[PDB]
Structure formats: structure tokens, C-alpha cells
């Protein structure tokens, strides 16, 4: 309701705010922080949208088809995507992370290099991005000035010192073995899944992104309204174990269940604020 400000210094003035929403029906807490930059020297205004918050993984063994079949639902993807409309004159200047990456933990410090510039570092005062993603990759979805977005999808994973196993893993005897607790163990199918204790925390607790898009709009721009869609989603897979005769045999079905959680925020470039 105020839009808080700092400034650094007689060049710029950082109008900063935060916009949270808790999508209980999709198990997501979207946290969207924003920072307006007003470097009078440079000709354009910079908006840096930091998309924090947490998507719950929603790993779940969901039914029992007798004691020889059972299905597991697990998160094989997470996304966050920003996207301006086709007609609009604002442009996506910069974004972080800038490349795709494996590393367990991403981390970089964003600062403003007094030139309409905002660059990242991995080792002048500003805040820093970090997010952990064990057993996952981060893929930069094909960005342009209109649209940018990340998808942290499942990479591979060890299973009780065997493995590693991925979504496209296959053994003729045992099939796919991602969350197969035992191989030829006589028990209820539903009891023979891998405890979420023994896999990635992104599967249970879930993902918590810390990405940063930055948008530029010119002071001279004839229309200072600016709408943008911020879509968090969760792709989930279907993994069924079933007894064969002599042993167990699992199998994955890619991308059964999706959870597109779209919000759309308005940006007053003049009064330098943002709200859903």
C-alpha cells in the first residue's frame, strides 16, 4: 500500500515491494518481489521481478489395485514463466539464471552496474539469488524479449546404492526402478514404494525457485500501463509397480498430471508499483 524506497545515489531510487499469493488448491505459495530502478542518467526504467516462493512436490502413492498393483504420483517437473502480451512495448531486458545448469545449488549475486545494467556473479550493494535442486536440471525455456521461463525437470537419481535411474530408465526383467523399494520382495504393492525419506526433497517438500527477470520500459513510452502473466506449474508422473510372477516390475508414464497456476499482475510505470 506504500511502495517502499531506498536510493543509490542521486542517480537512482529503488522503489521496492512484495506481492504474495497462496494457491491452496494447487499446493503453491507464490512470492513475487519487485524492484523499480530510476537511473536518471539512463533513458529507460528498469523493473526487476524476483519470483520466489515454494511449489509443493505432491509425491503420493494414490491407490491400491489389490496387493499386486499400486500407483505413485511424483513431481517430474516445475516451471515458473513470465510473459508479456504481444502488443505491448515493454521488453524483457535480462534474466537470471542465464544458462541451463546441473549444479545442486544455484547461487548468484545481482547488482546494478550504474548503466541500466544488472549482472550476476558466482563467488555496489544488492541482493542475491539461490535455490537448491538435488536430482534435477534447470532448463532455460527458449527466451525472447516477449517471454522467459525456466523448467527444473527431473534429471536422474540413485536408488538404495543401485542406479542411477531416470524417467526413461529400463530393465527387461524389472522395468523402470526409480522408486522400487525391493525387487523380488513378497509384500503389498503399495508398501513397496521408496519412502520419500530416501529420495530428493524436491519430490516431497518441493521446489522453491529464486529466479529474476528484469524488464525495461522507456520514460518516453506513450502508454505506462503494463500487464504480465506469471505462471507457476507442476508436471507429475505416474509410476506403477506390479508383480509379474517371479519379481516386481515398475513403469513410468510421463506427464500425467499438470498444475498451471496462472496469475496476472499490473505495473504502473509512472507511480512505480505492481499489484494483482
Amino acid at each position, epitope marked *: 500500500i506504500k511502495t517502499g524506497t531506498t536510493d543509490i545515489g542521486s542517480n537512482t531510487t529503488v522503489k521496492t515491494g512484495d506481492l504474495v499469493t497462496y494457491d491452496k488448491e494447487n499446493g503453491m505459495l507464490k512470492k513475487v518481489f519487485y524492484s523499480f530502478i530510476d537511473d536518471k542518467n539512463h533513458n529507460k526504467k528498469l523493473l526487476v521481478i524476483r519470483t520466489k516462493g515454494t511449489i509443493a512436490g505432491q509425491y503420493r502413492v*494414490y*491407490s*491400491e489395485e489389490g496387493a499386486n498393483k499400486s500407483g505413485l504420483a511424483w513431481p517430474s517437473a516445475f516451471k515458473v514463466q513470465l510473459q508479456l502480451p504481444d502488443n505491448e512495448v515493454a521488453q524483457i531486458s535480462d534474466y537470471y539464471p542465464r544458462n541451463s545448469i546441473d549444479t545442486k545449488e544455484y547461487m548468484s549475486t545481482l547488482t546494478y552496474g550504474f548503466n541500466g545494467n544488472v549482472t550476476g556473479d558466482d563467488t555496489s550493494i544488492g541482493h542475491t539469488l539461490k535455490y537448491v535442486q538435488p536430482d534435477f536440471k534447470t532448463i532455460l525455456e527458449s527466451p525472447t524479449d516477449k517471454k522467459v521461463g525456466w523448467k527444473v525437470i527431473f534429471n536422474n537419481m540413485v536408488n538404495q546404492n543401485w542406479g542411477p535411474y531416470d524417467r526413461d530408465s529400463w530393465n527387461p526383467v524389472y522395468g523402470n526402478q526409480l522408486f522400487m523399494k525391493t525387487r523380488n520382495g513378497s509384500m503389498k504393492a*503399495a508398501d513397496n514404494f521408496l519412502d520419500p525419506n530416501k529420495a530428493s526433497s524436491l519430490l516431497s517438500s518441493g521446489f522453491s525457485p529464486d529466479f529474476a527477470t528484469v524488464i525495461t520500459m522507456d520514460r518516453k513510452a506513450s502508454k505506462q500501463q503494463t500487464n504480465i502473466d506469471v505462471i507457476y506449474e507442476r508436471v*507429475r508422473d505416474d509410476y506403477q509397480l506390479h508383480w509379474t510372477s517371479t519379481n516386481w516390475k515398475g513403469t513410468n508414464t510421463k506427464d500425467k*498430471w499438470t498444475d498451471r497456476s496462472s496469475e496476472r499482475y499490473k505495473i504502473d510505470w509512472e507511480k512505480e508499483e505492481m499489484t494483482n
Partner: antibody
Amino acid sequence: QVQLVQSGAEVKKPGSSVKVSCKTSGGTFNNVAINWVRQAPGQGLEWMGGIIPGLDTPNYAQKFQGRVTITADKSTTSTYLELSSLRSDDTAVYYCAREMEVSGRWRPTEAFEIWGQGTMVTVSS
Amino acid sequence: ETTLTQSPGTLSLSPGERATLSCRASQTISNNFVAWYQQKPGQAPRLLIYGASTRATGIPDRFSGSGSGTDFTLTISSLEPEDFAVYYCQQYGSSPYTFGQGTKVDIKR
């Protein structure tokens, strides 16, 4: 004030099929499992099936042999319990019972926390 | 199935006295997941205890769960007028999610 409100009582000719509904009032809907439990007059309770709306994954009791078939619906925020080839011995109260919405649930269901009023199905020729 | 079987049949006691309902399983119910419901005439049942020992929201300390292996037991610390009803144990781990037959408590004259 999260709450369930089931359909009106009914009476069905034996051989026909019934389906009672159960709408979720207050509170969330999607990944919280709704079960159906049934009670004959002055009798024990009997689990029949459940459904996890979001996944739309039904969980059926195997004794019933798929006569029982359960579904969910977002527009109505409700579940349905259909039962085919009704008989004299089905005449019972039919409660829907939403599970307890616990933090880290990775199993189907767990502990039937809030129940509807029950629907009376009374199969008689 | 994993068939529970409660005891005793009826429980003829007066208020102030403690009543200990027992419930025993075919096989281990895991131990995760065993609930106790109280049903009064005409109404639906009412979740008292879950998991095994921890009690559902709003239930008074009077009601108390405990057990292990294949024997679980609900204890009413000090029976109160309203507590005289039927009591149903259940396991909700393995499908089919079996219910006990039911033990009734009964004001004693």
C-alpha cells in the same frame, strides 16, 4: 468451517443402480481424499472406495468387484459414489467422509475427519 | 483383509469411572494408522484419535489412544454423560480399510 453435504435419501428397485453425491462446502478440495463408508441399520461401518480429486485416482475396495465406482468434479467441488445392480442387502446409510488434511501425506487417505449427513439408500421391490 | 475385533461387547459403567476399549487386528496394521471414532445414535461417527495415539483437533484429553503390534486401546479417563455411545476402531493403512465391529458403552443402573 470446512464441511460436506450429501444428496437426498432414495429408494431403488433391486437390480437398478444408485449414485449419491457429496459436495465439499468450506475449505480446500483438490488433493484431499474423500472416502465413502456405508452403514446398514444397526450395524458395522464398511469402506467402499475413495477418490483423490486432483489426481482423480479412485481407490476401490476389492470385495465389491467394481460395482462401486467413484468420481470427482471441479465445477461442483463434489464426489459421486455410484453402485450398480442394487440388492436388498445394500439398503444402508452412505456417508462420504473427507480425510484429515495432514502436512506430508504421501499415502492414499488417512483418518476420516469430517463426514456428511449420510444418504439413505433403501433398496426394496 | 486385516480384520479388527473389538472388546468387550458392552461396557456397563457410570460417569467418573474410566473405561478402556480394546481392539485387536488380524495382522499388524502397520502401527501407523489406527483411528477411533465415537458414533452417537442417528448421527455420523466422530474422529477421536488417529495414527494410534495422537488425538484429533478439539477432542478433550479425557480421550486417549495407545498400543502396538496387533493390540490398540482407547481410554476414557473419566466418563462424562455425553461419552455414552458406540466406539469403533479402524485401521486405515492397508486396503480394504477395515473397521472393528464396535464396542458400546452403557450407563449402569
